[PDB]
Ligand binder design. Structure first.
Ligand code: EPZ
Lengths: 53, 394
C-alpha cells in the first residue's frame, strides 16, 4: 500500500479518538474555521489597505 | 503569477452589495495574486501552501473578516477563492521536488469532517499536495488530475461521507461559532452527484487514480474498494436529499433549535415552498379518531404500518388518503377541519374532499397558523395569507 493510503487510515483512527476523547476533539476543532490569526491578519490589513480603489 | 483561469461571474440581479463585493473580490484576486498566494503559503495553517482549499482562501479576502458577513458574502467571493486555489495547486506542482510523489484529493458534503480529517493526517516526505474540494462536477478536477499524471505523481481521492442530517447539524454549530455554514442546495447537489463524478473520474483515468472512502456514520470506517465507495455514497437523489434537508431546517427553525440567521444561510437561495410541493404522499394515509391522528404508510405487501401518532381531542373517525388530496389553487378560500400537517404540507378536509396546502406560502408559514383538529378557512388575497377560525359552540 502507498504512503497516502496509510496516512488516510491513521487519520481515520484519530477521527475515532475524537468521539471518545473530548479533550482531543476540542484541540482539533479550535483552529480549523476560526479565521486568520492576528499575525496573518496584520499582514492582510496592509495588503488590503495598500490596494483600495 | 497569473491566475490559472478566468473567474466566473454570478448574476446577483438587484442586490448591488453582492455585485460590488464580487467585483472587489475578482479585482483583488486578479491583481494581487503574487502576494495573496505568498500569505496563503508562508503564514496560514496550510502546511506551507500544500493544503490547498478554496474555503481557506476566503479568509484572505477583506469582506470575509467579520463572522457576521461571511454567510452573506460567501457566494460573491467563492469563485475568486476557487480560482486562487486552482492557481496555488499549479504553483505547488511547478516546484521541482523529486522526493514528493503523492497528491491527495479530499471530497465530500459540507459538514462531514473533511477538514478535521485533513488536520488528523500527518504529512509525509512523499506528500506533495493535498486538495480539498468538490468532485461531484468533476470537469475541473480532470485538469488537476491530468497535470498530476503528466508529472508521474500518484493521485489518491478520499471521499468523506456522512448522512445529510448529521452533516447539517455540524454546519449549524460551525455557523453559530464562526459564521460559516453551508446551504442545503449545495449539500444536496454534492451528496447526490458525487457517485456520478467519482465514476466519471474512474472511467476516464482507471487504475492511475486510486479512489477510497471514509464512512463517518460507521466511526470513520476506511473503504478501500471503489464498488464499496459507491454504495456508501449512494444516499439518495438530489430531489430526495434536498427535500429531507428542506423539511429538516424548517422543523429545526419552527422548534427553536436554530436561529433565523442560521436558517437563512442553510436555506440559501431555495424557494422551500417549491421543494415542499414536490413531496409525494402516495402510499400514505391519516387515520383519525377521538384519541388523535395516525400517519400510516403502505409497503408492497399491502400492509399499513404506523409512522407517527399525534394525540388530539375532538375529532370524528375517518380515513384520509393523502396522495389523493387536491392541490389548493391560489385566490380561493378552503373551509374545513385540519386533519394532518407536517413540515411540508397542511391537509384540510373540505366539503369537496381533502385539500392540500403547502406549509409555506410566499415566505409565509401556514403550518404554524393552524392546529390539527381545528376548523378554519384558508385563503390567499393578493399573495397574502388569510386564515380565519370557524370554531363555534351551538
Ligand atoms: C460547488 C461549489 O461551488 N462549492 C463547493 C466546492 O468548492 P470548490 O471545489 O473549491 O469550488 P468549485 O466552484 O466547485 O470550483 C472547483 C474548481 O473549478 C475551477 N473554477 C472554479 C470557479 C470558477 O469561476 N472558475 C474555475 O475555473 C477551479 O479549478 C476550482 O478549483 O467544494 C467545497 C468542498 O470543500 C464546498 O465547501 C464548496 O461549497 C461552499 C459552501 C461554497 O460554495 O461556498
Amino acid at each position: 500500500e502507498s504512503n497516502a493510503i496509510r496516512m488516510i487510515k491513521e487519520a481515520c483512527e484519530k477521527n475515532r479518538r475524537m468521539m471518545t476523547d473530548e479533550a482531543f476533539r476540542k484541540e482539533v476543532e479550535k483552529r480549523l474555521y476560526a479565521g486568520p490569526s492576528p499575525e496573518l491578519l496584520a499582514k492582510l490589513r496592509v495588503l488590503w489597505a495598500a490596494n483600495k480603489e | 503569477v497569473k491566475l490559472s483561469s478566468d473567474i466566473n461571474l454570478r448574476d446577483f440581479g438587484n442586490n448591488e452589495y453582492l455585485s460590488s463585493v464580487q467585483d472587489e473580490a475578482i479585482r483583488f484576486a486578479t491583481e494581487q495574486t503574487d502576494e495573496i498566494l505568498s500569505l496563503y503559503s508562508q503564514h496560514a495553517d496550510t502546511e506551507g501552501g500544500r493544503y490547498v482549499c478554496a474555503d481557506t482562501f476566503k479568509e484572505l479576502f477583506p469582506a470575509f473578516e467579520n463572522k457576521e458577513d461571511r454567510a452573506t458574502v460567501n457566494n460573491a467571493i467563492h469563485n475568486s477563492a476557487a480560482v486562487l486555489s486552482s492557481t496555488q495547486f499549479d504553483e505547488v506542482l511547478k516546484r521541482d521536488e523529486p522526493q514528493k510523489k503523492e497528491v491527495i484529493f479530499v471530497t465530500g458534503i459540507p459538514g462531514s469532517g473533511k477538514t478535521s480529517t485533513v488536520k488528523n493526517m500527518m504529512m509525509q516526505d512523499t506528500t506533495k499536495l493535498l486538495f480539498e474540494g468538490q468532485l461531484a462536477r468533476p470537469q475541473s478536477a480532470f485538469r488537476k488530475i491530468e497535470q498530476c499524471l503528466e508529472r508521474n505523481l500518484e493521485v489518491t481521492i478520499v471521499a468523506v461521507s456522512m448522512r445529510a442530517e448529521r452533516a447539517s447539524d455540524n454546519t449549524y454549530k460551525r455557523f453559530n461559532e464562526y459564521g460559516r455554514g453551508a446551504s442545503i442546495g449545495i449539500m444536496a447537489d454534492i451528496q447526490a452527484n458525487l457517485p456520478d463524478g467519482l465514476k466519471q473520474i474512474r472511467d476516464k483515468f482507471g487504475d492511475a487514480v486510486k479512489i477510497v472512502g471514509i464512512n463517518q456514520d460507521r466511526n470513520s470506517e476506511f473503504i478501500d474498494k471503489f464498488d464499496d465507495v459507491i454504495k456508501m455514497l449512494s444516499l439518495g437523489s438530489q430531489e430526495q436529499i434536498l427535500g429531507r434537508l428542506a423539511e429538516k431546517i424548517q422543523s429545526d427553525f419552527d422548534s427553536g433549535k436554530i436561529s433565523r440567521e442560521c436558517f437563512n444561510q442553510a436555506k440559501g437561495s431555495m424557494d422551500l415552498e417549491s421543494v415542499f410541493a414536490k413531496k409525494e404522499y402516495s402510499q400514505q394515509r391519516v387515520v383519525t379518531n377521538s384519541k388523535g391522528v395516525t400517519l400510516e404508510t403502505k409497503s408492497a405487501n399491502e400492509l399499513w404500518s404506523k409512522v407517527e401518532q399525534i394525540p388530539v381531542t375532538g375529532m370524528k373517525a375517518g380515513i384520509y388518503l393523502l396522495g389523493q388530496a387536491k392541490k389548493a389553487e391560489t385566490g380561493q378560500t378552503y373551509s374545513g377541519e385540519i386533519i394532518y400537517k407536517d413540515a411540508a404540507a397542511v391537509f384540510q378536509k373540505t366539503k369537496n374532499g381533502l385539500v392540500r396546502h403547502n406549509a409555506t406560502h410566499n415566505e409565509e408559514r401556514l403550518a404554524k397558523l393552524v392546529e390539527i383538529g381545528q376548523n378554519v378557512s384558508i385563503g390567499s388575497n393578493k399573495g397574502k395569507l388569510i386564515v380565519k377560525s370557524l370554531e363555534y359552540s351551538a
